[PDB]
């Protein structure tokens, strides 16, 4: 038996605006989990493999976000801030990137998927929807392990130089 340890996981702190797909992706690298493994631990089954793709066709319910909150130690009201606000239409096909800000905070911000967003206001730069050199479309944000293009291996921080 254990000598007086408290039950634990490699918890992670969320960044100031990352998407739920990106956060779950980091959580399941801090702990080595598969997408269906994290869904099974949370008790919500195969649901997590939709959310990592932004397949929010039926939206994340209060009861499902609370189930994830019991794993990841973030309350349901802070998990809701990683999803679009009520009636803010997102798009889940083109994954998009600022890249200039990815040097200030290495994350996929949820706001880059809003249908109303076309330029990052912190930097006044046009948002990217493909790698500026090889034209490859970005992987889903849960898979942003390297923080670079998967085809030509150019860092996302260097795509700051190639945009607008």
């Amino acid at each position: 038996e254990a000598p007086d340890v408290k039950p634990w996981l490699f918890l992670i702190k969320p960044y100031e605006g990352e998407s739920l797909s990106h956060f779950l992706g980091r959580f399941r690298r801090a702990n080595h989990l598969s997408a269906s493994g994290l869904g099974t631990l949370a008790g919500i089954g195969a649901i997590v493999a939709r959310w990592e793709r932004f397949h929010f066709n039926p939206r994340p319910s209060q009861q499902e976000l609370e189930a994830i909150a019991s794993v990841v130690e973030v309350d349901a009201q802070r998990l809701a801030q990683m999803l679009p606000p009520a009636g803010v239409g997102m798009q889940h096909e083109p994954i998009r990137l600022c890249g200039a800000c990815y040097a200030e905070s290495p994350c996929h911000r949820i706001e880059w998927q809003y249908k109303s967003v076309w330029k990052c206001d912190r930097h006044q730069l046009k948002i990217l929807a493909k790698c500026p050199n090889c034209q490859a479309p970005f992987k889903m944000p849960a898979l942003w392990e390297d923080g670079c293009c998967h085809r030509c291996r150019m860092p996302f921080a260097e795509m700051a130089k190639l945009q607008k």
Partner: peptide, 26 residues
């Protein structure tokens, strides 16, 4: 994994292998 009370309990043999190495580290 249990002597440390790491919360994750289910997994493939290959997943437990990787996860054990990862909880012995850090």
């Amino acid at each position: 994994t249990e002597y440390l009370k790491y919360r994750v309990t289910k997994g493939t043999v290959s997943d437990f292998r990787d996860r054990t190495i990862e909880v012995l580290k850090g």
